[PDB]
Amino acid sequence: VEIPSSFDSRKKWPRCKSIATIRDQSRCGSCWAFGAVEAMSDRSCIQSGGKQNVELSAVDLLSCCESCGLGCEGGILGPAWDYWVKEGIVTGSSKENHAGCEPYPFPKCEHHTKGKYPPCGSKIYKTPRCKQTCQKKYKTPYTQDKHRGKSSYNVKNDEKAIQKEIMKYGPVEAGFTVYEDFLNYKSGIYKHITGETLGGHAIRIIGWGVENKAPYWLIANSWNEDWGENGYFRIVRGRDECSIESEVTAGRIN
Numbered sequence: 001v002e003i004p005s006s007f008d009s010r011k012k013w014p015r016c017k018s019i020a021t022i023r024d025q026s027r028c029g030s031c032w033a034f035g036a037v038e039a040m041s042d043r044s045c046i047q048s049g050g051k052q053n054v055e056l057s058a059v060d061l062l063s064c065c066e067s068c069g070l071g072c073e074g075g076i077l078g079p080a081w082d083y084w085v086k087e088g089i090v091t092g093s094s095k096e097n098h099a100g101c102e103p104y105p106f107p108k109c110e111h112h113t114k115g116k117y118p119p120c121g122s123k124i125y126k127t128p129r130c131k132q133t134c135q136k137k138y139k140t141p142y143t144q145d146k147h148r149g150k151s152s153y154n155v156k157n158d159e160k161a162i163q164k165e166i167m168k169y170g171p172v173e174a175g176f177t178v179y180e181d182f183l184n185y186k187s188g189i190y191k192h193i194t195g196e197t198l199g200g201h202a203i204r205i206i207g208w209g210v211e212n213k214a215p216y217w218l219i220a221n222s223w224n225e226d227w228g229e230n231g232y233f234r235i236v237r238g239r240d241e242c243s244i245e246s247e248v249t250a251g252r253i254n
């Protein structure tokens with residue numbers, strides 16, 4: 001396949017409303033579960049030609065996956081996509097939308113940036129319990145609201161392989177190393193210049209582009225719309241910046 005010089009999943013599949021939705025993980029290390037349910041929502045819609053047009057529940061995966069790690073204390077991508085294949089994930093919107101089977105219990109907060117939400121601060125919530133119960137107004141039983149995948153895989157640590165995966169099958173989840181300067185990001189094309197490691201972050205890659213000859217990935221963060229470029233950031237593409245090309249995971253419904 002010829003790879004275009006830029007690609008935006010939001011523009012290829014505009015009927016799939018999840019693709020342009022920015023979420024907020026709140027005071028919780030649930031990034032691993034947000035990048036997962038976001039990319040699964042997108043891919044469920046894209047691969048079903050818009051038939052499965054849903055917002056999958058971050059709290060269902062976060063609270064119920066026994067193999068994914070430590071809930072609000074952080075997690076692992078492979079087992080999140082295996083959970084989607086094996087048990088599936090119910091629907092559920094943000095806390096403020098309170099739509100679907102299991103909406104997120106935690107409110108929007110600012111992640112080391114200025115804006116109109118309360119600051120996240122340094123304390124995290126306890127991981128919610130696995131309740132397996134749809135909100136009272138939702139009239140599908142929990143187990144009947146499950147959306148499943150067929151396959152999950154790691155994507156090759158190769159720029160062109162990742163571009164082909166995104167443009168054919170949809171946004172992907174990806175891990176990268178967070179250095180302190182990432183917390184100062186306001187706009188433009190991120191690269192690590194200053195600061196020590198703060199650990200790992202999991203995000204959603206939706207496309208790519210080039211500006212002033214600088215190639216980038218276009219990424220949806222889960223820190224609400226006030227963070228970065230209306231909730232998005234760009235990061236140098238092609239040099240495995242912060243290991244962005246080395247921890248890509250996704251999956252298919254068919």
Ligand SMILES: *[C@H](CC(=O)N1C(=O)C=C(OC)[C@@H]1Cc1ccccc1)[C@H](C)NC(=O)[C@H](CC(C)C)NC(=O)[C@H](CC(C)C)OC(=O)[C@H](Cc1ccccc1)N(C)C
Nearest residue numbers: 028029031032069070074075077175176178199200201202
């Ligand atoms: C999401 C990322 C996140 O919440 N972050 C940041 O990256 C920067 C932040 O500051 C606002 C937030 C807040 C934060 C909240 C709780 C803890 C730490 C920071 C989460 C935390 N990241 C992950 O889940 C990560 C995803 C990968 C890249 C796919 N994985 C991990 O962090 C693993 C989780 C274990 C295996 C369960 O752990 C590590 O990578 C460890 C840290 C660790 C070790 C033992 C128990 C818990 C965490 N490393 C030493 C980096």
Ligand code: NA
Nearest residue numbers: 226227228230
């Ligand atoms: Na901003």
